[PDB]
Structures are given as C-alpha cells and as structure tokens.
Design a protein around this ligand. Structure first.
Ligand SMILES: *[C@@H]1O[C@H](CO)[C@@H](O[C@@H]2O[C@H](CO)[C@@H](O)[C@H](O)[C@H]2NC(C)=O)[C@H](O)[C@H]1NC(C)=O
Ligand SMILES: *[C@@H]1O[C@H](CO)[C@@H](O[C@@H]2O[C@H](CO)[C@@H](O)[C@H](O)[C@H]2NC(C)=O)[C@H](O)[C@H]1NC(C)=O
Ligand SMILES: [Cu+2]
Ligand SMILES: [Cu+2]
Ligand SMILES: [Cu+2]
Ligand SMILES: [Cu+2]
Ligand code: NA
Length: 495
C-alpha cells in the first residue's frame, strides 16, 4: 500500500536480511525500501516523521529529504541536515508539510543526515498526474510498477573503516538480491506482468554509490520520464542509471509468456550475474515459477545516451546559446585529494547552524554564511549556468541540485552542448576526465539549495556546496513553523 499524501512515517531500527545476511538497519515504515509515499500533482503532503531510532551505530538523529521536490516556499522542509534544518532527535517527530505544485513524476525520499540513508532510510515518492500526457502509453501504473535499485552493505555506514575502499555487498532490486560474496540463494524479487499489457515502470535509483546498467532480457524499454520530467519516447535496451536518478519506461509485455532476467549491473562490487547476483525476475502471468533462462546480449543495441533524451514539453534552455550565456555563469572546480573532495578549494563540512537558520537570523550575504567558502549566493530571477568539469577521483559523479531541475546543456562523454532541446533533470552524471557537463536553471526559488555529488560517501567527504538562492527573499518566501524553529534548540540541547 502506498501512503500519503498525509501520513505518519516511523523511522526505526530493525534487523533485515535482504540478501540473506542479517544486519541492523534504519528503516522508514519498517521495510527496505521504505513504503512508497504518493499523491497527486499539486497535493499538500504532510509527512509526520517519527524518529524512533535508538541504535547509535547508525545515528539516532535523522532528517529526511524529498528528492527532486522543489520545496518552493518550504525550504525548511527540504531535509538536508545543517542546510535546511537541524536533525530531528530521537523520541521526537517533525511534520514535513509542503506542496508539490507543477511537479508530477517519480521521486524518492531518503535520510539526509550523514550517510544514514545507506543504512536503509530510502524509499520511493511518486506524484501521480491525473492528466498525465503519457497516460495513453500504458495500462498499468501503480505500486507494483515501481522498481528500486539499491546498493546494500554488510558493514554499517558509520563503521566503514578509514582508508578501506567502500563497495557494496549486494545489489537489491525491489529490496531483494543476492550477496556478491558467500552468495546464498536468497529470494529474488519478482515483477509480474500480464501478456499484452503495457506498464509504466518507474525505475528509481536509491543508490548510495554505484550506477547500474539496467536491462530486462528480451525486452525494450521506452523512456517517458527522466527525474520527474516528461520526455519524448525513447526506446532503449539498457539504461545506465546513476545514483538518485529516475526514469519511467513503458514495458510492453510482448514477449512469450515466461521468465526473463532483470539485470542491474553496478559499476563497482560484484560483476556479472553468477548465482543470481545483480538480478531480479520478470515473470509473466502463467509462466512456471522458476528462474529465467535468458541471457543478456554481449552488446546492447540501443543503450541510453543522455543526449538522445528530449523533453515532451517545449522546455527549451534558458539563457543564450553559448557557454557563459547566462546571467551568472559558474564553473566549479571539483577536486579530490587525500580522502576529501572540494569545490573551488573548499571541502564541505556541515555547519553548526543550518544555513537556512543563519539566513533567517540575519546573515545576508554569502560571505556571512557558514561554512565559509561553501555557500555561494545566487541572484534572483537570473539564468544560472553551472559547468561541472569532471576528473575528480571516484567518478562518474552524479551531481544533484536541490530546489530545482535543470537543463542538461552538456552531457557526459560528448563535448557538444545543446542549447535547444536537452533533457531537464535533477541528478546528472558529470562524466569522465575532460568532460564539461553543464546545467542551467533560473532562480525563482528563494532559499539555500544543496548542490552535491549524490554518491553519499562523496558528500560525506565534502563534495558539496550550498547555493543561497535569493538571500534577500529567503525569509519572506519561506515562513517557518514553530516546530522547525524548535529543532535546533532541541538538537543542540540533546547534543
Ligand atoms: C567548461 O565550460 C566552461 C564555460 O561554461 C569553461 O570556462 C571558461 O574557461 C575559460 C578558460 O579556462 C575561461 O577563460 C572562461 O572565463 C570560462 N567561462 C566561464 C563562464 O567562467 C571551462 O574551461 C570548460 N572546462 C572544460 C574542462 O572544458
Ligand atoms: C552529442 O551531443 C549533441 C548535442 O546534444 C548531439 O547532437 C544533436 O544530435 C541530434 C541527433 O542527430 C541533432 O538533431 C541535433 O541537431 C544535434 N545538436 C547539436 C547541438 O549538435 C549528438 O547527437 C551527440 N552525439 C552522440 C554520438 O550521441
Ligand atoms: Cu536524493
Ligand atoms: Cu535532492
Ligand atoms: Cu561523487
Ligand atoms: Cu542533497
Ligand atoms: Na532558450
């Protein structure tokens, strides 16, 4: 069952064994992934998050971000700890009360405190469109058509040893999968389809790190949505999906009744599918209950290439059709050395006072805001360009901007910009050495918006800045409830 748009959401510790290995976790709604939060476009979400965490090994504070939702006028509800709020302390609750005007698509929610979402606090968030322009492309779109891709670790996120390479221990598809080492034949997820029907599969990367090469043996996938943005139909046979991205694709159940492997190959961790790792099962109604016997091709015929995506709507690109053709054109120097990432020479370390509270308390320029050098002001009502040249270790880095989606004027692995009809999205791979992935957006959403690599380990190691968008209108735009105002004093008192 989906929950919302008005719902409680309990955050608890529990043991889970999604790949046959038991470990404690941080869960929303008692499950991994958490329950799907859903509503319709324009709805008022009121998600009362109950922090019932007691195991300090995964942090007993929490804060939840609603990934991809713009939070216009509700910056305080965005969730990134020490950017828009202090964490919720254990035994307390907090009502994230916001609206979703002008958005409809596939989103997700996750802890936004430290690396806590890796420990399990992640789930889908769907804003349905009663008049979806893509509605006539499919027959079924419901909780059974959401596909989550997750990395899963046997070591707790706070306990990953300093200086050891972090890699996952399993890929989980809809919460189930098999471990890369000491593989046991634990249950695989089954996605069931009826021959002849067409399904809106909502593919959600809830990854903390790896990108996945996602495919379904025997089937093609017609992309119709990218990170909440409706796209023209683009048929592919493989999707490389980076952390935090979403796609909807139409799956036409047009193959012989049978079982077909669903594949999600991460870029690190276990390679291949031995023992049924990196796998789930697409089962047609009437098929025998047994594992697929299909194989992947050696080479996919039509992998997704981001430049092939185009918005369904005439979204264009703001600004002028050349590099620097913006009101505020930025080029960030993204670097890694010695275990720390930096942006323009500053490694992000969260401040004591949330950025939003600093602004509300009177800090009125970015030089007043902490962390020093980590907060960049953006002028209001302006076209922003941000070039994100890659090269920093650990890539490809999926950069994500809160509060906004953006035109992807230049994509990974292709030096040619597109000032005409690029896809808009909210999380973008910045590609490889020499690339110059570049985004554009207009600043019509006052508040401090995080920009960071969505590889959670990289965020934790400093790969972030805050855009303090329209500082002058931030307080007026984002009236705060008393309960928000109460968070920092409670947090700081609890220590
Ligand atoms: C990525 O594109 C940006 C522009 O969007 C390039 O930035 C320019 O860099 C040149 C030379 O380094 C400067 O003289 C310009 O002033 C920069 N433009 C802006 C808006 O600052 C950048 O060089 C490109 N990077 C890569 C690696 O191709
Ligand atoms: C590299 O990216 C460019 C820009 O997005 C792609 O160029 C577009 O190609 C389409 C499809 O042929 C044309 O209709 C557009 O006119 C092109 N736009 C520009 C600005 O050149 C190009 O296809 C991408 N390369 C690959 C190999 O996919
Ligand atoms: Cu996110
Ligand atoms: Cu986000
Ligand atoms: Cu990264
Ligand atoms: Cu974030
Ligand atoms: Na334009």
């Amino acid at each position: 069952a989906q929950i919302g748009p008005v719902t409680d959401l309990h955050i608890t510790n529990a043991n889970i064994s999604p790949d046959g290995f038991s470990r404690p976790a941080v869960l929303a709604g008692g499950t991994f992934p958490g329950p799907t939060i859903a509503g319709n476009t324009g709805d008022n979400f009121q998600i009362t998050v109950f922090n019932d965490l007691t195991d300090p090994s995964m942090l007993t504070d929490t804060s939840i971000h609603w990934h991809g939702l713009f939070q216009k006028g509700t910056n305080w509800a965005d969730g990134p700890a020490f950017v828009t709020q202090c964490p919720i302390i254990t035994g307390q609750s907090f009502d994230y009360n916001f609206n979703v005007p002008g958005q409809a698509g596939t989103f997700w929610y996750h802890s936004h405190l430290s690396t806590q979402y890796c420990d399990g606090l992640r789930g889908p968030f769907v804003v349905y469109d009663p008049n979806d322009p893509n509605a006539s492309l499919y027959d079924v779109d419901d909780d059974t058509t959401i596909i989550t891709l997750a990395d899963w670790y046997h070591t707790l996120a706070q306990q990953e040893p300093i200086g050891a390479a972090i890699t996952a221990d399993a890929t989980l598809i809809n919460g189930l999968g098999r471990s890369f080492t000491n593989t046991t034949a634990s249950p695989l997820s089954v996605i069931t389809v009826q021959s002849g029907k067409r399904y809106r599969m909502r593919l959600v990367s809830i990854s903390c790190d790896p990108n996945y090469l996602f495919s379904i043996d025997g089937h093609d996938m017609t992309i119709i949505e990218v990170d909440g943005v409706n796209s023209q139909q683009l048929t592919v046979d493989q999707i490389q999906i980076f952390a935090a991205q979403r796609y909807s694709f139409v799956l036409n159940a047009n193959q012989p009744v049978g079982n077909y492997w669903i594949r999600a190959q991460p870029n690190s961790g276990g390679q291949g599918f031995d023992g049924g790792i990196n796998s789930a099962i697409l089962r047609y109604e009437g098929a025998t209950v047994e594992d697929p016997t299909t194989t992947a091709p050696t080479t996919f015929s039509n992998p997704l290439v981001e430049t092939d995506l185009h918005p369904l709507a005439d979204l264009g690109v703001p600004g002028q059709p050349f590099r620097g053709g913006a009101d505020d054109p930025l080029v960030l120097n993204l670097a890694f050395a010695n275990g720390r990432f930096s942006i323009d020479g500053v490694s992000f370390v969260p401040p004591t006072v949330p950025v939003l509270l600093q602004i509300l308390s009177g800090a009125q320029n970015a030089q007043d805001l902490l962390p020093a050098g980590s907060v960049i002001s953006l002028p209001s009502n302006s076209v922003i360009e941000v070039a994100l040249p890659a090269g920093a270790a650990g890539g490809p880095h999926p950069f994500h901007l809160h509060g906004h989606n953006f035109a992807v004027v230049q994509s990974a692995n292709n030096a040619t910009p597109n000032y005409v009809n690029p896809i808009w999205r909210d999380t973008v791979s910045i590609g490889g050495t020499g690339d110059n992935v570049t985004i554009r957006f207009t600043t019509n959403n006052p508040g401090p918006w995080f920009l960071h690599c969505h590889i959670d380990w990289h965020l934790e190691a400093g790969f972030a800045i805050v855009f303090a968008e329209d500082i002058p209108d931030t307080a007026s735009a984002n009236p705060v409830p008393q309960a928000w105002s109460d968070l920092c004093p409670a947090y700081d008192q609890a220590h």
